Write a protein that binds this ligand. Structure first.
Ligand code: NA
Length: 291
DNA sequence: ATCCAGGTCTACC
DNA sequence: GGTAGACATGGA
């Protein structure tokens, strides 16, 4: 557990003595799309049909708009607070080549996000830029999500499966998924009619989970790894996108090695900590725009 | 401009 | 089971 205790306030909860927890590292490392940095350094996000604001002050984290019951049943796990990241970093740091990346993203934690939202979010991520991905996800939410109110503004929850099933390919194109619109529609249809079951897929071991996810149109090896890592906690995942590819070619492999070979290399070397190693590498590579 | 961005699908061998 | 071209969008 990377925290001591919690104090329930009137309109917030204070998590005391949190370790390995930095807002920029967590919300900007590439894993999430609905968290927005505020002028004061706080971040406001929309997840699980709730609007939450997070502030870090010294060794404490203040989570606004939630109570103690919600922290225990939803948010403590959302921020993966029961895992000791000190041990993860210690193990990974034994590899000198990973040290600089780990040091750069010491406050990273892998959030435990919703499978349905993550599935669609990363289908949208294919050959796309994060700012555009965020816009598309927010548009989809504004178009059919439930209204949430927080500090004078109305936010929109991610749509339910039933509401998203009402989308036509054109609707997705309007939220602008581009050519990915057909993939989103086909995928929502398969979820709606029960062809593929996310709860069942999430219960499968890492390799089997990966294989089932690729059955979805628009989901390949990279998107499947992102989905199982970010919403199913399958930590042997090693999503190789353009940035992780660059990071690996700088440290472990030659420039002509295929993405499949890079994925296999990483999973063999990092094992059960592959997903974590991947995040530190991605964050360092993208933030420092390595060439 | 050509390329790139959290790649995948298709066609092909 | 391993590789070229197509596929939208917008920033640089
Ligand atoms: Na697929």
């Amino acid at each position: 557990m990377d925290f001591d205790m919690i104090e329930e306030k009137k309109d917030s909860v204070i998590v005391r003595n949190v370790e390995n927890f930095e807002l920029k590292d967590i919300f900007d490392c590439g894993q999430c799309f609905r968290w927005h940095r505020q002028e004061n350094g706080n971040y406001i996000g929309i997840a699980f049909e709730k609007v939450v604001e997070v502030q870090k002050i010294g060794e404490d984290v203040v989570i606004y708009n939630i109570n103690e019951e919600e922290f225990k049943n939803v948010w403590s796990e959302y921020f993966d607070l029961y895992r000791d990241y000190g041990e993860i970093k210690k193990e990974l740091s034994r590899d000198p080549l990973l040290k600089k990346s780990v040091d750069f993203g010491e406050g990273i934690r892998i959030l435990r996000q919703d499978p349905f939202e993550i599935l669609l979010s990363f289908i949208i991520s294919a050959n796309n830029r994060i700012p555009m991905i965020k816009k598309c996800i927010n548009n989809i939410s504004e178009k059919a999500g439930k209204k949430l109110e927080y500090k004078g503004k109305i936010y929109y929850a991610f749509p339910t499966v039933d509401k998203l099933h009402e989308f036509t390919e054109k609707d997705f194109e309007e939220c602008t998924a581009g050519f990915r619109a057909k993939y989103l529609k086909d995928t929502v249809d398969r979820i709606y009619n029960g062809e593929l079951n996310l709860e069942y897929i999430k219960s499968l071991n890492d390799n089997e989970c990966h294989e089932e996810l690729k059955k979805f149109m628009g989901v390949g090896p990279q998107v499947a790894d992102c989905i199982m890592l970010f919403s199913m906690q399958k930590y042997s995942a090693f999503p190789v996108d353009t940035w992780v590819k660059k990071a690996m070619m700088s440290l472990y492999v030659a420039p002509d090695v295929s993405l499949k070979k890079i994925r296999d290399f990483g999973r063999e070397k990092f094992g059960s900590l592959s997903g974590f190693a991947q995040q530190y590498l991605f964050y360092y590579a993208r933030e420092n725009n390595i060439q």
